């Protein structure tokens with residue numbers, strides 16, 4: 057699967073909020089472009105002169121994420137974060153010359169990402185009470201991955217001693233994205249677990265944190281809540297459900313060629329971290345069928 061690479065696979069079936077540290081530092085920002093950031097300003101002016109209702113927004117930037125030695129006590133993950141924007145995204149990751157900016161970063165800084173905005177996404181593998189994952193169909197009229205399958209999520213906007221507030225906002229944001237798009241009550245959702253981090257190579261390597269969330273509603277009830285918002289309550293054009301049993305072999309199905317890269321990330325991490333039993337009981341052939 058060339059369009060998605062794993063940056064992080066969490067241990068212990070996934071990491072809760074209280075085991076994660078963040079360092080939000082201007083040392084983690086994008087480096088100014090070799091010829092100057094005027095080139096980002098020029099793409100933005102052109103875009104606003106066609107679509108003057110567009111507005112900029114701040115984003116978190118992923119620099120790096122370091123996992124503690126497995127089985128250790130204390131914080132298990134450090135996320136190194138800076139700040140970027142929708143505008144810096146449009147002028148770098150989304151630019152036609154994005155591959156040239158990756159080569160320049162390798163040459164200048166020993167870092168393919170040094171000249172890229174790399175805004176941090178969040179996504180969820182959202183399971184129902186009746187053991188299904190939730191999928192959404194993307195509109196055919198949006199700029200990115202039109203008409204493809206997605207999972208719930210988005211790209212949080214800002215606002216360990218500011219770090220903990222930043223971790224809280226990331227975990228809060230995946231639940232808020234589920235309530236905004238799927239139309240579920242907050243109180244039907246578990247606290248998220250972080251499964252890992254996946255990179256979208258079709259979007260010059262920008263990363264998404266992938267989370268596991270359990271809902272107390274059945275697939276039937278989740279569908280009712282989604283539809284009862286009406287065509288204006290969501291950006292997606294449809295919702296559908298796959299049995300957790302069947303997610304295990306999803307990369308062998310015709311669905312796989314219709315998943316956008318960040319949703320492929322979420323399903324691979326679900327399969328490795330929540331799937332893939334290690335013990336004798338869930339390992340036994342009748343519960344883990346071979347092939």
Ligand SMILES: O=S1(=O)C[C@H](NCc2cccnc2)[C@@H](O)C1
Nearest residue numbers: 115141142145150175199200211
């Ligand atoms: O947070 S972002 O900068 C906003 C962006 N939205 C999709 C999009 C794509 C191309 C042009 N406009 C919007 C995220 O994919 C990254």
